[PDB]
């Protein structure tokens, strides 16, 4: 039911947003690879999880990403209902 138009951007959406965490860690008052697993984990409802953002602002980026997980997969499994 999901067209390839949305697939490409959402697939690349996680990659371009995970890097901002380590970028934000530069001026904080955990390598880049060790921080990217978090975002892909959030969406996939996975059981693998370790390491959390340390800076206060980095949590906000992780915070807003949490809401994106709930809206997509739940609504995606609502279109199939019809």
């Amino acid at each position: 039911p999901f067209q390839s138009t949305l697939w490409l951007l959402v697939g690349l959406s996680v990659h371009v947003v995970a890097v901002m965490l380590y970028l934000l860690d530069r001026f904080s008052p955990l390598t880049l690879s060790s921080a990217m697993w978090f975002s892909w984990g959030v969406l996939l409802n996975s059981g693998i999880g370790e390491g959390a953002p340390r800076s206060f602002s980095a949590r906000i980026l992780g915070m807003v990403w949490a809401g994106f997980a709930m809206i997509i997969v739940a609504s995606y499994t609502a279109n199939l209902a019809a």
Binding site: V17, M20, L24, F27, S28, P29, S57, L61, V64
Partner: peptide, 19 residues
């Protein structure tokens, strides 16, 4: 507005860090 909210809060800790 996510990063826009992040960048404006990015300098918020800079104020505490620099003062």
């Amino acid at each position: 507005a996510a990063m826009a909210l992040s960048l404006i809060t990015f300098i918020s800790e800079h104020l505490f860090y620099w003062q």
